[PDB]
């Protein structure tokens, strides 16, 4: 129930309306990533780099297995059954992730029966038939590079240089990998890890993983760029150096009787000065309730806002009174920079601050003037069929509000200062004045 007519005079021109939708109902698939390549067809002079690489990988991967083994040891069937005394400290999300891990262990056990076949894979991407209808997907790191560069040139170069090149490739892979799977991975028991982060074990190529799994949907890009596709590590093998990851594919469901409204800020004039209004630019209206939205964590689209979680945020009563037509409770800030917007377009109607920018009507050839008692001017074709704003000429529509828009004034809010350091200064000044009144009262 926003009052757009009053909000427009303080330079809050309404924008487009968007829908609100959140992910739900995920489907699951399992993939296998092998973190060590196969060097059989070039093994004659690989040197001792592979033993050192295995030594590094074992130390990298041991803490993950150690953390996974906590929930695996203490989960049984009493239908998922847990022992709270042994776990000790946990959160709700971690408990749910442990339940999901227990459920995924059933398929992990079947996948683990093909360990010999997994060890012998010699291609970047392979598919193994576990059954007539079931397939296992295996992805190997640095296999393509070896097969395409090192094997072909094994005879044209002394393989001391080949050993050096293999060592550099392995070290670069480890350097890229450490940013995600290192000590930063404090809690592997969770499903908030995105597929893009996991794909760093495959050189950052999540497109290959997604197209090999065969996920094809209209909202694929929207789900991908909103961090809605996530994965979970369910098994770590310290002998063959491979991991099993379950991937979740949710769908987007639209919340009914909910939408997000945008406001375009425009500077306005008051007492020979230029001001802007300090109000939220995105408002989440759900049923009839007005609240804030953490729009920075979501994905904005032409006609929708996609989030992986509900980001509703409470709103003060004074701001709610502001948004419903009480313009005297809306704070404003002074403008000292030369780079701020001075006009905007809404439904073919032009809202401009014709004091800071020259306005002219092409049909009559005479300028458009703004009085000192007005904040903005509403320009439509009832007074100017086409207007010139500097280097642009635009034809205008008709306003659907009050006929007397340019003759009705409104009340104005109090000035503010939103700088971080100014916030600390304003608190001190108020507190000192508060103590002065306290002593004078006493």
């Amino acid at each position: 129930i926003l009052h757009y007519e009053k909000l427009s005079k303080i330079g809050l021109v309404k924008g487009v309306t968007r829908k609100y939708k959140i992910k739900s109902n995920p489907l699951t698939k399992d993939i296998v990533i092998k973190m060590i390549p196969n060097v059989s067809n070039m093994s004659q002079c690989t040197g001792s780099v592979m033993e050192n690489y295995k030594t590094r990988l074992n130390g990298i991967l041991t803490p993950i297995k150690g953390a996974l083994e906590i929930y695996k040891n203490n989960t049984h069937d009493c239908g998922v059954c847990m022992a709270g005394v042994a776990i000790g400290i946990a959160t709700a999300a971690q408990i749910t992730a442990g339940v999901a891990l227990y459920e995924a262990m059933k398929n992990a056990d079947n996948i683990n029966k093909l360990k010999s076949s997994i060890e012998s894979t010699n291609e970047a991407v392979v598919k193994l038939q576990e059954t007539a209808e079931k397939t296992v997907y295996v992805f190997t790191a640095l296999q393509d590079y070896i097969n395409t560069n090192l094997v072909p040139t094994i005879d044209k170069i002394p393989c001391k240089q080949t050993e050096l090149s293999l060592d550099l490739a392995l070290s670069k892979y480890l350097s890229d990998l450490l940013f995600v799977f290192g000590p930063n991975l404090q809690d592997p028991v969770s499903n908030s890890m995105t597929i893009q982060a996991i794909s760093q074990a495959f050189g950052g190529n999540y497109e290959t993983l997604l197209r090999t799994l065969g996920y094809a949907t209209e909202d694929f890009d929207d789900l991908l760029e909103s961090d809605s596709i996530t994965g979970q590590i369910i098994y770590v093998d310290l002998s063959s150096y491979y991991i099993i990851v379950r991937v979740y594919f949710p769908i987007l469901t639209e919340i009914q009787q909910a939408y997000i409204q945008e406001l375009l800020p425009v500077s306005f004039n008051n007492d020979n000065s230029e001001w802007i209004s300090i109000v939220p630019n995105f408002i989440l209206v759900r049923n009839t309730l007005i609240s804030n939205i953490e729009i920075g964590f979501c994905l904005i689209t032409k006609r929708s806002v996609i989030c992986n979680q509900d980001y509703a945020t409470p709103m003060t009563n004074n701001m709610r009174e502001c948004l419903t037509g009480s313009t005297e409770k809306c704070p404003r800030e002074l403008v000292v920079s030369s780079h701020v917007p001075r006009f905007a377009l809404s439904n073919g109607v032009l809202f401009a601050n014709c004091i800071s920018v020259t306005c002219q009507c092409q049909t009559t050839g005479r300028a458009i003037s703004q009085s000192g008692e007005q904040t903005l001017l509403m320009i439509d074709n009832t007074t100017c069929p086409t207007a010139v704003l500097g280097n642009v000429i635009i034809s205008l529509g008709k306003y659907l509000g009050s006929v007397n828009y340019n003759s009705e004034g409104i009340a104005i809010g109090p000035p503010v200062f939103t700088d971080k350091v100014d916030i600390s200064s304003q608190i001190s000044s108020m507190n000192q004045s508060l103590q002065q009144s306290k002593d004078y009262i006493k």
């Epitope: 029966k113 093909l114 010999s116 076949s117 193994l128 038939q129 059954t131 397939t135 065969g214």
Partner: antibody, heavy 118, light 112 residues
Amino acid sequence: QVQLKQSGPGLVAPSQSLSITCTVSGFSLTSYALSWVRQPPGKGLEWLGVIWVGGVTNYNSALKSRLTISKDNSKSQVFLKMNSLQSEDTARYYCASRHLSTGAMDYWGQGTSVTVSA
Amino acid sequence: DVLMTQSPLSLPVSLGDQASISCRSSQSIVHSNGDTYFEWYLQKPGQSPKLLIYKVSNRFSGVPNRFSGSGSGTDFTLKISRVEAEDLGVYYCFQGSYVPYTFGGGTKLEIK
């Protein structure tokens, strides 16, 4: 190298049971699936069934559920067991290994001739 | 089930000519994972069948370049550029996508 050996009784009286053993060498049953194929004397090849790595088996639907296939990883042997043999079942039986990827039967055994008669 | 039709039944061809064998399926044999498991086998008399083309267009190790496989959808063809004496035998098209797996009718190569 890899090679396949079959063994069997050869002559089977009608309405009795048939047992054929295929012994693998050069590769392990934990990394290959095995299929059974038979050929009538004047007909083309026919598919009987396959046993996967995990022990799941699939059979030809037309064989009237008279087939069962089992394997022994420790002895590296796979056994073909058939009951209610009749005159129509006289054929040359092969055991072939199916690759986990590319799904091809790349290795074949020498075959065992089975005759059902009085 | 998937019925496999192979024609011609017999292909009388003189030495050095081109041979083309076509095998057709009653329905699409694309597996749920995207692959198409289709193979060609050659059986010499008194010998076990051997693998020539282990996918639609993938040639097995040790197979001469004279053999080339191609096809899509429900039509698959095998082309022999230069017919030789050792190529005489029976050719089978085998599908391995949907249970039960089925063999082709078999094409008998014959010297004209």
